[PDB]
Amino acid sequence: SESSIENFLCRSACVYMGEYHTTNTDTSKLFASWTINARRMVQMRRKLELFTYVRFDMEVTFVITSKQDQGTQLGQDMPPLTHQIMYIPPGGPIPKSVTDYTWQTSTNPSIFWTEGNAPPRMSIPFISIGNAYSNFYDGWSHGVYGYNTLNHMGQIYVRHVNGSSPLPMTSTVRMYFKPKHVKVWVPRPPRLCQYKNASTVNFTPTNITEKRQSINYIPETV
Amino acid sequence: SESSIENFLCRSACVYMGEYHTTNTDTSKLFASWTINARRMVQMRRKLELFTYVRFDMEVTFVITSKQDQGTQLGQDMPPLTHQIMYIPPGGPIPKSVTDYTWQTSTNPSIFWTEGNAPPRMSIPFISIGNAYSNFYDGWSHGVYGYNTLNHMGQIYVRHVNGSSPLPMTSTVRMYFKPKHVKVWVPRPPRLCQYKNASTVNFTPTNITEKRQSINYIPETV
Amino acid sequence: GLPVMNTPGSNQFLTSDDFQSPSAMPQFDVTPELNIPGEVQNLMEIAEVDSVVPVNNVEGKLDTMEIYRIPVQSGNHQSSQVFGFQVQPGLDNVFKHTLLGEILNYYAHWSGSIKLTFVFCGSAMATGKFLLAYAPPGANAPKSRKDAMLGTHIIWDVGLQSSCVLCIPWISQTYTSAGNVTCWYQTGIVVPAGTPTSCSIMCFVSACNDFSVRLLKDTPFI
Amino acid sequence: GLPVMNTPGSNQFLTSDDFQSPSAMPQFDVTPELNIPGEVQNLMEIAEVDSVVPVNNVEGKLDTMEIYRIPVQSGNHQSSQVFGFQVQPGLDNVFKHTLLGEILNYYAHWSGSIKLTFVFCGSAMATGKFLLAYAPPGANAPKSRKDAMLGTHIIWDVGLQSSCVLCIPWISQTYTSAGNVTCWYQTGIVVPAGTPTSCSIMCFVSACNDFSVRLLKDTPFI
Amino acid sequence: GLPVMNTPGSNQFLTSDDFQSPSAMPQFDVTPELNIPGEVQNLMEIAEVDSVVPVNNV
C-alpha cells in the first residue's frame, strides 16, 4: 500500500532557490528564473529513473522572503511588497529585462501576490504533444545525443511589482514541486554510479558491491 | 466519564523547547533537533507508567518565534522568515549540517512555513513493527538493560530556509505533543520514588508514607 | 466562489481544540492490533482493587515492613484501644499513598463509598474479641469502650472469623469534619501452652462501585 | 453572509497537505493516453524478479564478471565447504545491490519470505553431489558436513538436476541474529576424458508474494 | 459558531482564480442583447477561411 506508485512518487520537494533585487547595476539580478525539469534534484532523479515513461500533473508552491539591504538608509515606513510569478508554456516568449513587453502577454499565466498572506500555488497539467514523457532517449534531437524536444515543460520567472524608482530590497524564492496523478511504464534497474552532470548519463566505472573476508565468512552469532 | 482512558491521557503538553540561528561559528547552532519519546517529561511519564503496553497516534504543533540579534546593524527591511520542519521515520537518514543532502530526501516528510500565519501541525500514525509500545522492558537490547528497539518513534529537525549569505537571526521553537486514539494494557502501581535519569528506573529508597503522633491519634473535631 | 466570512478565533492555537489534521505518512499501513490480556477502559478499575494500608505510620518504622502491622499484645487489657483513624482518602497520611489514594489525587472533586477489610494474622489456637466502631462526620471519637458500644459497632470474634468487612457511605473532600473508626479490646487474647504470645492485624482498603471523580488536575507528588 | 470562524492551521503551508488547486491552463485539452506495454502499479512487481547475486565478493575481483561465479574445483574434496552466507537483504553486502535489496533500502521496515535459486554451469558430462543446508536465526553456522546433515538440508545431484530452489520464511530487519545457508561437497565432481576440470555455480534471489514494506525514507546510496 | 479551519492558500491573489465577486452596481438593469449578424463561438472559424498567399516574397 505504501509501495504503490502514487505513494512512492507523489511527494513535495524543494527544487530551486533563487535571489533577486529591486535595484541593481547588473539587471540580470532583478529577476529570477527556472527551467522545469527533474534532472537537477538528485533524489527525485533516481526514483524517477526506475521507469522509462512517465505521465503526471505538476503542483508548485512558492515561499518568498524579503530583506532591506544593509547598505545605509534607515527610518523607512514601507507598505508590504508585491511579486509577480509568471509561467511560460512551451513555445512562449522569454523576457530579457524586467521592463520587457513579455511580462504582459495575455497567454503567459501569471500570479500577483503580496507578503503576509498564504503562500501562492499554481497547478499545471500534462503538457506534451506526445503521449508520455521519457526519462531515457536513445536518439538525436534532429544534433544532441539523448535529448528530445517532447520533454519541454516550460519555465518560471519571478520579479517585483513596484512602480518607478523603487527602494532597495532583496528577495529569495523557494519553489516546491509535486507530481500528481502519476503513471509509469517499463521498469529499469537502479542507478549504480554517481551522476556527473544534468544532461547525460555519463559515469565513471564503479564496483559491483563491497568486499568481505572470504566466500565462507559468516559473522559470529550473538 | 472523566476517568476514561482517553480523557486521562489525550492532552497537549510542551515537551521540547530549542533555539537555532541563521549564522554562527559553531554550525550545530544552525538547526534544532529532538528525539521523540515520553520519558523526559516528568508529568506525562508518570501517567504513562500506570500501564505496561500503550498504543496511540501522535499530533504535533509548533510555535515559532524569531528575533534580530543584538549584535549591531539596524535599519533593516526584511520579508517574513521561512522555516522547514522535517520528520524522520525510524530507519531514516540523519542530517549533520544544515547544507546536507538529507534535507532533500523524498521519504522524509517535511513542512514549509512562513511567519505570520497559523501555527503548523502534523499527524503521525502508530509506527511500529510490533503490536504495541512498551513502557517497561525486562530484557537486553541484543547490550543495554531495559531498552528495546521496537520503541523507536523517529526524530524532528528544524532549520531556516534562506538562500546564500543570510542576515543574522535567532529563532525558538516549542513543540506541543498530544497522543490520540489510545489503548492501554496491564495496570501497574504508581511510581513512589523520584526519577533519576531518563533511561533507567533507578531510584533511591523512599519512605512508605509520612508519620503521625501515635497509632491512636485522630485530630480534634471542629 | 462561495462567499465566506472569517469569525473571531481564526488562526489561533487552542491547546484543547479538536480538529482533523493532515497525516505525514499517508502511504503506510499500520500493524494490526493484538489481543493482549488485561485491557483497561477506565481508571476506576484500578481503584476498586484492595491495597494494604500503612496504619502503623509512627516514628522509627516508616521504612520497614512493620509499618503495615497493627500490634496485638498479650495479657489482659480488656478495655484499651487498639487503633483509630479518620477516614479521609486523598488527604490523610495513612490513606494517601494507596491505590485508591493515588488516583483520587489526580482530581479536584470526588465522592463515593469505601470498603475496609481487617484480617487477623495469629495462630489458629488464639481466641478473643474485638469491638470495631464507626463515628459519622461531625462526631467526636469515642473515649471509652462503653461509649463506642453505644454507637454503631460490630463485635468480632477471631476464634470464629479471621476477617471483618466495613462499608462507609458518605465520603467527600474539602479539625477534619470526617468520620472515624476505632478498635477496642473486648476480652483479651487467650492461648494454650506453646503458642506465640503477640500477634498482628492487617487493613485493606478499596472503593465501591459508585465512585465518581471530576476536574482532572496535576498531582502533588513528583 | 454565512457566519464563519477560522481555526488554527489557517494560512499555513503543510508540505504533505492534499487540497484542490487552481489550474493555470484551463483552456487546454490534453493528449489522450496511449496503451504502452509494460505498465506498473506497485514496486513489489520489481522485487519479485530474479537477479544475480555477487556471492564471490572478495578482494581483487569486485570489478569483474568473476564476482558472480561460485568456483567448483576438481579432484576429491568430499567434505569441504563450497560457500556460505547470512540471509540479510538490505543490510548485507552480498544482497545489498540486487533488485530486491535496492527496493528494501527505501523503507524502514519490511518483512516476508525469500526465494533462492542455484544453477550449475558445468559440462553435461559432470556428475556429483552437493549438500545445501539452512540454519534458522539464532543458530550458529554448521562447522562440518555431518552437523549440516543433522539439520535442515537438501542433497542436490547435478547429474540429475541442473538447478535447486529454496524458500526462506522468517525475514525481517533491525552478531547478526539472522539465518544462514551453507554448501558442502558430498562427493566431489567426476568427469570423463576430454572435459574441462573446474566449473561454476550461480545464485539468483527474489521475493515471494507475501512481501510488505513500511515508512518510506531516503536511500543511502546517492 | 460553526468551527472552521483555514487552509494554505488563504488570502492570496491568484491571477487565474475563478471566484464569485461582489457587484458594485447591483441596482442597474442592463441593456438586453441585440441579434447582430455574424457571431463567433470559436477561433477556428477564422482559420477555415481562405486567404491569399504571398508566394513571390523576393
Domain boundaries, chain A: 1-222
Which candidate, A136, A151, A160, places its Cα nearest to that of A82?
A160
Query: To probe the interface with A, which of D12, D14, D17, D30 has the most A CB atoms within 10 Å?
Result: D30
- Secondary structure, 3-state, E17-49: CCCCCCCCCCCCCCCCCCCCCCCCCCCHHHHCC
The beta-strand segments (E) located in chain D are: 39-40, 51-52, 70-72, 81-86, 107-121, 129-135, 152-157, 163-171, 180-185, 199-207, 212-216
- List phi, psi (to 5°) of B103: -70, 0
Cβ contact A4:C28 at 8 Å: no
- List phi, psi (to 5°) of A139: -155, -165
* Nearest-Cα residue of chain E relative to residue A62: E9
Element (H, E) at C132: strand C129-135
Distance of CA C4 to the CA centre of its chain: 57
Cβ contact C12:D8 at 8 Å: yes
* Nearest-Cα residue of chain D relative to residue B87: D217
Chain C contact for E13, CB < 8 A? no
| Chain A residue numbers touching E16 (CB-CB < 8 A) | 109-111, 122
| Chain E residue numbers touching D7 (CB-CB < 8 A) | 3-6
Cβ contact A135:A49 at 8 Å: yes
Chain E contact for C12, CB < 8 A? no
Cβ contact B91:D217 at 8 Å: yes
DSSP state of B9: H
Which candidate, B18, B28, B109, places its Cα nearest to that of B65?
B18
Chains touching chain C, criterion 3+ CB pairs below 8 Å? A, B, D, E
Cβ contact D205:D50 at 8 Å: yes
Question: Residue holding cell 531495559?
Answer: B146
CB neighbours of A191 closer than 8 A, spacing ≥ 6?
A: A46, A49, D222
Which candidate, B4, B76, B8, B18, places its Cα nearest to that of B46?
B8
Judge: A111–E8 Cβ closer than 8 Å, yes or no.
no
Cβ contact A103:A93 at 8 Å: no
Cβ contact A24:A201 at 8 Å: no
Judge: C29–A2 Cβ closer than 8 Å, yes or no.
yes
CA angle B107, B108, B113 (to 5 degrees): 130
Judge: B185–C36 Cβ closer than 8 Å, yes or no.
yes
Cβ contact C206:C49 at 8 Å: yes
Question: What is the per-residue DSSP string for B23-43?
Answer: S-SSSSTT-EEEE--SSS-HH
CA dist list (Å): A161 to A17, A115, A166: 20, 12, 10
Cell of C117: 477489610
Question: What is the per-residue DSSP string for B127-165?
Answer: --SSSSEES---SB----BT--GGG---EEEEEE---SS
A contact set with C (CB within 8 A): 1-4, 6-8
Task: Give contacts of A 73-92 with B, CB under 8 A.
Answer: 73-76, 78, 81
CA distance D111 to D204: 19
Count Cβ atoms below 10 Å from residue B204 Cβ, excluding itself.
7
Nearest to D3 among C7, C12, C24 (CB): C7
Count Cβ atoms below 10 Å from residue B174 Cβ, excluding itself.
15
| Chain A residue numbers touching E14 (CB-CB < 8 A) | 111, 113, 120-122
Query: To probe the interface with B, which of D5, D6, D7, D14 has the most B CB atoms within 10 Å?
Result: D14
Chains touching chain D, criterion 3+ CB pairs below 8 Å? A, B, C, E
- List phi, psi (to 5°) of B15: -115, -15
β-bridge partners, A14: A176
Count of residues in chain E: 58
Cβ contact C184:C92 at 8 Å: no
Question: Residue holding cell 479551519?
Answer: E5
Question: What is the per-residue DSSP string for chain A?
Answer: -TTBHHHHH---EEEEEEEEESS-SSSSTT-EEEE--SSS-HHHHHHHTTEEEEEEEEEEEEEEEEE--SSS------PPPEEEEEEE-SS----SSTT-GGGG-TTS-EEEEETTSPPPEEEE----SSSSEES---SB----BT--GGG---EEEEEE---SSPPP-EEEEEEEEEEEEEEEEEE-PPP-SPP--SSS-------SS---S-TT--PPP-
Nearest to D97 among A7, A127, A209 (CB): A209
Q: Tell me the nearest-neighbour CA distance from B172 into chain C, angstroms.
A: 17
| Chain C residue numbers touching A8 (CB-CB < 8 A) | 27
Q: Tell me the nearest-neighbour CA distance from B150 into chain C, angstroms.
A: 12
* CB burial of residue D108 (10 Å; 0-12, 13-18, 19+): buried
Judge: C8–D5 Cβ closer than 8 Å, yes or no.
yes
CB neighbours of E21 closer than 8 A, spacing ≥ 6?
A: none
Per-domain boundaries in chain C = 1-222
CB neighbours of E11 closer than 8 A, spacing ≥ 6?
A: A117, A118, D11
Question: Residue holding cell 503548523?
Answer: B120
CA distance E2 to C8: 11
Question: What is the per-residue DSSP string for A10-62?
Answer: ---EEEEEEEEESS-SSSSTT-EEEE--SSS-HHHHHHHTTEEEEEEEEEEEE
* CB burial of residue C209 (10 Å; 0-12, 13-18, 19+): exposed
Cβ contact C131:C153 at 8 Å: yes
- List phi, psi (to 5°) of D207: -105, 150
CA dist list (Å): E19 to B156, D21, D77: 39, 13, 84
| Chain E residue numbers touching C1 (CB-CB < 8 A) | 18-20
Task: Give contacts of D 77-106 with A, CB under 8 A.
Answer: 81, 83-86, 93-94, 96-97, 99, 102-103, 106
- List phi, psi (to 5°) of D66: -60, -20
Cell of D100: 530486491
CA distance A170 to A194: 35
* CB burial of residue D214 (10 Å; 0-12, 13-18, 19+): buried
Q: Tell me the nearest-neighbour CA distance from A27 into chain E, angstroms.
A: 26
Nearest to E16 among A61, A109, A117 (CB): A109
Query: To probe the interface with E, which of A12, A83, A84, A117 has the most E CB atoms within 10 Å?
Result: A117
Cβ contact A31:A158 at 8 Å: yes
CB neighbours of E12 closer than 8 A, spacing ≥ 6?
A: A113, A117, A118, A119, A120, A121
CA distance B27 to B23: 8
Q: Tell me the nearest-neighbour CA distance from D99 into chain C, angstroms.
A: 22
Distance of CA B221 to the CA centre of its chain: 49
Query: At B70, which amino acid appears?
Result: Q
Cβ contact D39:A141 at 8 Å: no
Please, which experimental method was used? cryo-EM
Count Cβ atoms below 10 Å from residue A2 Cβ, excluding itself.
21
Which candidate, D48, D203, D45, places its Cα nearest to that of D114?
D48
Q: 3-state DSSP call for residue D83?
A: strand
Count Cβ atoms below 10 Å from residue D200 Cβ, excluding itself.
15
Chain E contact for D23, CB < 8 A? yes
Cell of C73: 499484645
Cell of E20: 464569485
* CB burial of residue A130 (10 Å; 0-12, 13-18, 19+): middle
| Chain A residue numbers touching B77 (CB-CB < 8 A) | 66-69, 76, 78, 167, 169
Cβ contact D215:D108 at 8 Å: yes
CA distance A154 to A127: 9
Query: To probe the interface with B, which of A65, A74, A221 has the most B CB atoms within 10 Å?
Result: A65
Which candidate, C92, C128, C90, C64, places its Cα nearest to that of C207?
C90
Judge: D6–E11 Cβ closer than 8 Å, yes or no.
no
Judge: D7–C4 Cβ closer than 8 Å, yes or no.
no
CA angle B120, B125, B128 (to 5 degrees): 135
| Chain A residue numbers touching E43 (CB-CB < 8 A) | none
Nearest to B89 among D11, D111, D215 (CB): D215
Nearest to D6 among E1, E4, E9 (CB): E4
β-bridge partners, B57: B180
CA angle C126, C131, C132 (to 5 degrees): 115
Which candidate, C149, C154, C164, C156, places its Cα nearest to that of C127?
C156
CA distance A94 to A83: 18
Cell of D111: 518483512
CA distance B148 to B144: 9
Chain A contact for E27, CB < 8 A? no
CB neighbours of B64 closer than 8 A, spacing ≥ 6?
A: B83, B113, B115, B119, B158, B171, B172, B173, B174
**Torsion over CA: D144, D147, D152, D155 (sign):** positive
* Nearest-Cα residue of chain A relative to residue D86: A218
Q: Tell me the nearest-neighbour CA distance from D175 into chain A, angstroms.
A: 5
